[PDB]
Amino acid sequence: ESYAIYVYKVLKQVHPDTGISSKAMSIMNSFVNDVFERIAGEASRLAHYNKRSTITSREIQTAVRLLLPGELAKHAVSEGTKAVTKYTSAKKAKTRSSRAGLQFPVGRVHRLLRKGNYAERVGAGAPVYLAAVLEYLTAEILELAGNAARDNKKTRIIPRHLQLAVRNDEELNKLL
Known part of the structure; x- marks a missing residue:
């Protein structure tokens, strides 16, 4: 699955004047897919x-x-809980993602949760919470990788900046 456009939307919110190379975007897409699969698989086991x-x-x-x-x-x-509480209230919002306050795609996440046969049924709150988590992790990685890019006087994120960001962060390194 391609999440590239949502990775871009998040990039613009953390580093509005920083780009991302084609290879770096592919790595981000792989990160998002990997994390989705791991969380959905564990939710299924639970x-x-x-x-x-x-x-x-x-x-x-x-x-x-x-x-x-x-x-x-x-x-x-914190972000997943926030998204769910907002989504529950925001009945006049025009799209599921906007209802949740998110850039990541709540409907696509819901579809993928159903498509993966993780359980018999999937509630409306599950894809909201998961989309919010995926967005948060994306934003954190892009914040740090964009800081590496800036520290190296580059106007875009390239793979070595993702590596620096992830590998030098204790927790992201563990996760990824």
């Missing part, structure tokens, strides 16, 4: 472990806490 037939934001949250190291997990849980 649903089965708890004899639930529906994946909801509860199983996504616990999956996220199991997979993500300390601080990343705290911030991810």
